Ligand binder design. Sequence first.
Ligand SMILES: Nc1ncnc2c1ncn2[C@@H]1O[C@H](COP(=O)(O)O)[C@@H](O)[C@H]1O
Ligand SMILES: *Cc1c(COP(=O)(O)OP(=O)(O)O)cnc(C)c1O
Lengths: 791, 70
Amino acid sequence: GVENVTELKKNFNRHLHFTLVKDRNVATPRDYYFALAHTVRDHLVGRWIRTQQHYYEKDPKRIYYLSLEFYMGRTLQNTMVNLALENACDEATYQLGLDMEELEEIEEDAGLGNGGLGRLAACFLDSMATLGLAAYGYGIRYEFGIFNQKICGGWQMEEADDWLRYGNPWEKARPEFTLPVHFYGRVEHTSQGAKWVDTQVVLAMPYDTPVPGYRNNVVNTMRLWSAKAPQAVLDRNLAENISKELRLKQEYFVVAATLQDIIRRFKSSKFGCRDPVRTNFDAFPDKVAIQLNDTHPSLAIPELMRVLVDLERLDWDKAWEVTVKTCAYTNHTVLPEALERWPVHLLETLLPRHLQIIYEINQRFLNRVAAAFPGDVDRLRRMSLVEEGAVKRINMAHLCIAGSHAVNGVARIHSEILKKTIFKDFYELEPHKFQNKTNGITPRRWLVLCNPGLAEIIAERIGEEYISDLDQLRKLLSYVDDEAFIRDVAKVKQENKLKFAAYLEREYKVHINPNSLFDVQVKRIHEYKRQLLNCLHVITLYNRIKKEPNKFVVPRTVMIGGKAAPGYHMAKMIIKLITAIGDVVNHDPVVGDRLRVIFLENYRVSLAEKVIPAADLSEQISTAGTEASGTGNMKFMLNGALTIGTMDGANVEMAEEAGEENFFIFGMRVEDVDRLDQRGYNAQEYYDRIPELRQIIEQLSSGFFSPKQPDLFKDIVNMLMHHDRFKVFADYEEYVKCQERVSALYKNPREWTRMVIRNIATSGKFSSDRTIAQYAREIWGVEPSRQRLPA
Amino acid sequence: AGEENFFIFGMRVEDVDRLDQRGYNAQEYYDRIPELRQIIEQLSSGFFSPKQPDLFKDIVNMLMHHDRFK
Ligand SMILES: Nc1ncnc2c1ncn2[C@@H]1O[C@H](COP(=O)(O)O)[C@@H](O)[C@H]1O
Ligand SMILES: *Cc1c(COP(=O)(O)OP(=O)(O)O)cnc(C)c1O
């Protein structure tokens, strides 16, 4: 099938009529989107078959990325970009009287992920394919994502999400490869081994989706499972409900079904032949790599062990050896707090075999710490996998370190903290396991796709090789003083700022001024994230504008967006305050389009692609100490946005890449928060010293912003005043000093843009192709390849 | 009964509202009271919980940093 407008149009038509059984007379925009999606999917499948054949010829080590969420976004345009088809799809479609941008906007984002964890695994699947690695992402196929946020009168309505309601043109149901997953049962320890008998069964049906590497012709596989049930009505609902105990059920569902695939593919290694030959599991860790992305697939370890000892009859030690050499664990928390601990009671009902295996692992493991540090019995208590006390829990992270050969963090400092504080005894016992792998974003969805204009001008100077070697972006430092590049970088951001304003009108019915520096904060509406420090500052801009309604102010559109966890009262109230400041501020005749505050509803990957291109300022203001990575941060950097932030997470390594000089860093640092915790944080001090702050909390509790219900924000005022854990008032003064500096820079266009070129040039470290080449060499034992294949 | 026949101690309603307007900062008390310092030390150190040393650290952090009832 050719990438030549004539065959694209020809095949568009063949898919609309023959595939969809639709017609020019009854077809809708949506119907025309599926015929486009199916035209392009042809090209993706041609490359998929030859890649996959090629892995069977070469027999490489295959990497399996298990994850309980992949934040995939929308496949059509990423497919077009990775397959150099977008322009021909744009000609073809306009030669038939269709407009591709209109159609692209019909695709639903896949409901397969909630947030950063999901977008990481999703960006890793782009770079693993682009780096030619034989990788598979395995997960659950959720029929419904984590709601769709709707704002109804400043309050968040969680609207449901059947993203699959009209089919998905990108996936392929594989009914023939349905496997079983067993639950419950009893363990009969026979003569020649243990048997897990009397189990309830649930079927796991595979659905295949191809992932393209950027222009190298390598297309890999994301394979997600659906649960299918084979009082029976109830026995089928909870079965069918995999898509409390249900999460442990969903986690083992993805583990059990994926590993059957892994051992089948291992064994049926011969090109052509679908029978086994690899019966000797000694090569198993040279051929297989399982990447446990956070503790969620951690049962992959007692599961693999169960298969090799019980079913393949390999003895415990040999099987243990295969297991640790096959697994690795990526950690993403900073809080001891958030680790999964499963009570043993649930585990012995649901998985009585696996609890046996978790206890045997823990007996042997604890015998190893005993010889390594004799005497030491509280170290024993500390390192155990069973945690006793009120409720007896298995600590799943200690299972992953016990059974993996590399545990890593997603940022230098974090990974240091895992050695230093969190998993300190495990670092002391096996220091060699610990590693760090700083996150990244893919330069394809996060630059050449969402921002073809910046990529165009970057390419007119250094060609296109940087898209898979982002470290070539450093050549741009020669152009920092080049007046034509300073003018082109600026013009690109202006055209991106106009485009997003017109969207905001036809989707928000307010007019934003496309000259205002667009200040953008899009994160989970959570207290550690401090959207409230941002509210305190825009109310400051507002008040200041009021007092002297004629002084110059650098015009700003403050856009805040994110989801509030249902059930979290304070999160829902922050959104109501943010939309409430919008009513007062955006209508007050003295301000005009000097300030405008806007809540971006339903933030997700396609909205992210539309806002981050247009941003001038990236709000990275979480309290220092609360954050490990920050992939969004890296997206704003690459797209010509300057960051204002605290020294933490991704902001540390980016200040250090860009040169701190080129960063608006402010406020407390982890040393300073600890001192204030060691001395007592008392918000009433800040309130009393600072008159401009006093005004805000007054405005807030009197009813200024909500005159109809003049005590609506009492919760947020008492919390701020009397129980603010993330010390918002302790960074208020320095936040507004820092901001005053940003506006002063923005008053000078060439010097703003030069700071921007300095940021973009040094952004190369944060491409996920670096993160993946580091995983491949350091953890997986395989070697990145930009070798292109055939066509 | 007559106040004399009673052991009334501590703050009064007026005193706690005064304390709330200035801010209750639990730390101030701890820093100036030696025997209190010895007690919080014992609770963090697994003294009253030898086998699980960190057992009582949740109520310690509460007493010390989020004590709503002074
Ligand atoms: N032994 C084999 N020889 C060559 N191609 C194979 C073989 N096994 C599977 N394939 C290819 O890999 C794709 C996925 O199969 P599998 O990896 O078995 O899920 C198939 O559509 C085939 O194109
Ligand atoms: C980039 C991205 C992310 C990840 O960004 P965050 O910095 O806000 O989350 P954390 O990295 O965990 O701090 C999440 N969601 C979307 C839509 C997106 O584009």
